[PDB]
């Protein structure tokens, strides 16, 4: 049995719009954050709640960006988001 190309994408859309849990893996994200912070100050420590706040902010930002990117892609009569959709959304936002 095979579903056609897009049924399962819609399934994940419905599922992840019902859910609220974070979608990036915590430990890779924490290593990324600490690596990024190395360039500002050495031997820095982080509270766990600071890292969690960063992850919440990052995921909210990316989800809103993907919503705007979807509108830009649909505007060009497509269903596939492309880097140019992201660039247009971020240009309209003023980034």
């Amino acid at each position: 049995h095979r579903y056609r190309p897009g049924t399962v994408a819609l399934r994940e859309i419905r599922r992840y719009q019902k859910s609220t849990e974070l979608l990036i893996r915590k430990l890779p994200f924490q290593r990324l954050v600490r690596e990024i912070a190395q360039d500002f100050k050495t031997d820095l420590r982080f509270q766990s709640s600071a890292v969690m706040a960063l992850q919440e902010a990052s995921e909210a930002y990316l989800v809103a960006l993907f919503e705007d990117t979807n509108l830009c892609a649909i505007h060009a009569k497509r269903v596939t988001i492309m880097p140019k959709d992201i660039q247009l959304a971020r240009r309209i936002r003023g980034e």
Partner: protein, 106 residues
């Protein structure tokens, strides 16, 4: 003296008039704070809290829950037009998003 009565009770308010007054005085807002400004501000804060909590309790009852969670707060805010305008640049942690699939994608 007499029986120490709170200004919230005099105003018929649930929010604390004295604490809002002290936060205004030590908040570098003005040199002086009038007597009715904390009463008014507490009434405004109480009204906004009551609106959000009523809509969130409705959202919680719709999911057959007896306890408000961030999801119900987010559903209340994003489903209410004016609350969503007030909180437009705010992220609610663990709130998720509103269910919305563009019709061309179906």
């Amino acid at each position: 003296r007499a029986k120490a009565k709170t200004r919230s009770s005099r105003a018929g308010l649930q929010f604390p008039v004295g604490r809002v007054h002290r936060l205004l005085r030590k908040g570098n807002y003005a040199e002086r704070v009038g007597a009715g400004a904390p009463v008014y501000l507490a009434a405004v804060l109480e009204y906004l809290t009551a609106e959000i909590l009523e809509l969130a309790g409705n959202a919680a009852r719709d999911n057959k829950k007896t306890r408000i969670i961030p999801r119900h707060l987010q559903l209340a805010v994003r489903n209410d037009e004016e609350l969503n305008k007030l909180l437009g640049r705010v992220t609610i942690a663990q709130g998720g998003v509103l269910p919305n699939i563009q019709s061309v994608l179906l």
